[PDB]
């Protein structure tokens, strides 16, 4: 019954392909400059309104995550995802997802 690493990787690949299709779709809508769907190797972040803190349920296809939790990004007021200054990284808080690992 155990989920193998190989299945977990397949599920990530499936979520990544869905994210790509999602980005292409929302790019055909009327829009200003919302923060756009992005794949980070764990999650597909959804559209974000300028300024807002974006909460996503810890993904159900990650077998070991806390599914009652959320992960967080922030969309800046220019429509760019918030960064970690001085590091080559987008700001994201996955603490709730990993609290029991």
């Amino acid at each position: 019954d155990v989920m193998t690493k190989e299945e977990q990787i397949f599920l990530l690949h499936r979520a990544q392909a869905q994210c790509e299709k999602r980005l292409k779709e929302v790019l055909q809508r009327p829009a200003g400059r919302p923060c756009l769907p992005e794949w980070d190797h764990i999650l597909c972040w959804p559209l974000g309104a300028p300024g807002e803190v974006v909460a996503v349920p810890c993904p159900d296809y990650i077998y070991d995550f806390n599914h009652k939790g959320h992960a967080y990004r922030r969309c800046d007021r220019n429509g760019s995802w918030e960064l970690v200054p001085g590091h080559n990284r987008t700001w994201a808080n996955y603490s709730e997802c990993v609290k029991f690992l």
């Binding site: 193998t4 690493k5 190797h41 990650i62 808080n93 996955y94 603490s95 990993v98 690992l101």
Partner: peptide, 22 residues
């Protein structure tokens, strides 16, 4: 060990991912 293999892969994704405590 299949549980460990899977979890240790997740460790790398989180380390490379969770950045709010940097």
């Amino acid at each position: 060990y299949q549980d460990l293999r899977r979890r240790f892969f997740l460790h790398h994704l989180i380390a490379e991912x969770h950045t709010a405590e940097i």
